[PDB]
């Protein structure tokens, strides 16, 4: 191949219901994960519009506060070293490796890209043991701003002297996908639950969709 | 005091009950809860946009933003719903704590403008079928500039539209990403604590500089305070 496939991770790779029990136990509601995401994907837009930067993870717990407290719901120290331990230790869905092997096969380089900075080893892929299908793991840290900002879509390319043609991000979060495609990329939407594309005039829709990441892969070597 | 003070207000869940969806959320999900999924979706994709260089009004959004939260939650939705959602965003009732607010700020000396993401409409507007309209002197939004908040344009085109600086102005409204947007700018932030609504604590990150659990505890910071 010459196509590059920049890839998300958590929720896209790595299986984000596994903090389930965290939101089951203090908020008695496993269901509110999925306030408390957007939650943070939100403020995480919000300090990259204002021109204010913090690591993602503490975004998260700062968001997990703020989000517990909106449901009056007590929290702790605990709590928070819990959904640390968590957010950097989804296990990897079992149709990944199957599919990353087959595009490795395939010709396709595979990287990582994603809104959590560099921490020390091991990271969440490599405790998942599937670290090693990626040539390399980049991640929204230098340019100080998260996605959707096109600095952190256009610096990727830069760094990989790719071409926008020559690049698809693949993610379950349509806005990143939206956010790849506006700086010319193609985008590869993975339908994990809760994820739904955003049907709106101008908006631009996944250049590929699969149900799972086997079904995803079988649409990219397809491509050609 | 001569005040000088111009406070910008918020429309919508600051000033008019966004709970007055509750009923359609219980209808399409069984859960009224399915407000407090969709309304920092909705949130999220306006940014989104406006990160991206893309813009459609408010109103368009929040519909098919409502249609991606049923699909996540595999509800059905019917083009009835979405008639009622778009007439439910555009007819919030206002708080029972307004209106003597705005008296109290009004008398005390302040300019009072709004500031919203949503696009003008033909008359009446939500605040106008609220009837709390008239304490305003002007009424701004997003739609001419195409990008929503917390982007910095918004907050800088207004004041330039209002002749005044930073300094002089204050953001009132019960959604933090809002107050931290308008901070970041130089005013100040004045927080409403709606239901459903906390301030973010992280470092290097704008905390409100007054906060009340209701307008009128807000108004009695205010006039405490900003007497410039």
Redesign the interface.
């Known amino acids: 191949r010459s196509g590059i496939l920049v890839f998300d991770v958590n929720e896209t790779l790595l299986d984000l219901t596994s903090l389930s029990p965290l939101f089951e136990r203090v908020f008695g509601d496993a269901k509110v994960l999925?306030?408390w995401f957007?939650?943070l994907?939100?403020?995480s837009?919000?300090?990259?519009?204002?021109?204010?930067?913090?690591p993602f993870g503490?975004?998260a717990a700062?968001?997990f506060?703020?989000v517990a407290?909106?449901h009056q719901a007590k929290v702790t120290p605990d709590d928070i070293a819990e959904l640390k331990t968590r957010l950097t230790s989804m296990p990897a869905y079992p149709d990944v490796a199957p599919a990353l092997t087959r595009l490795q096969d395939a010709g396709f380089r595979l990287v990582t890209l994603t809104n959590s900075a560099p921490s020390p080893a091991p990271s969440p892929l490599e405790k998942a043991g599937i670290a090693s299908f990626f040539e390399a793991h980049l991640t929204v840290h230098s340019s100080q701003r998260f996605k959707?900002?096109?600095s952190v879509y256009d610096s990727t390319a830069e760094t990989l002297g790719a071409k926008p043609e020559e690049l698809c991000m693949i993610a379950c979060h349509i806005?990143d996908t939206?956010?790849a495609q506006?700086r010319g990329w193609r985008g590869g939407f993975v339908a994990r639950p809760?994820?739904?594309?955003?049907?709106?005039?101008?908006?631009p829709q996944p250049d590929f969709i699969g149900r799972d990441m086997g079904e995803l892969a079988d649409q990219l070597i397809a491509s050609l």
């Not at 837009?45 to 913090?54: E, I, N």
């Not at 809760?194 to 908006?203: C, D, K, Y």
């Open positions: 999925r306030e957007p939650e994907i939100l403020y837009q919000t300090l990259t519009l204002t021109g204010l930067y913090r503490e975004i700062a968001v506060e703020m407290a909106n959707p900002h096109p806005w939206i956010g506006a809760h994820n739904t594309p955003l049907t709106l005039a101008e908006v």
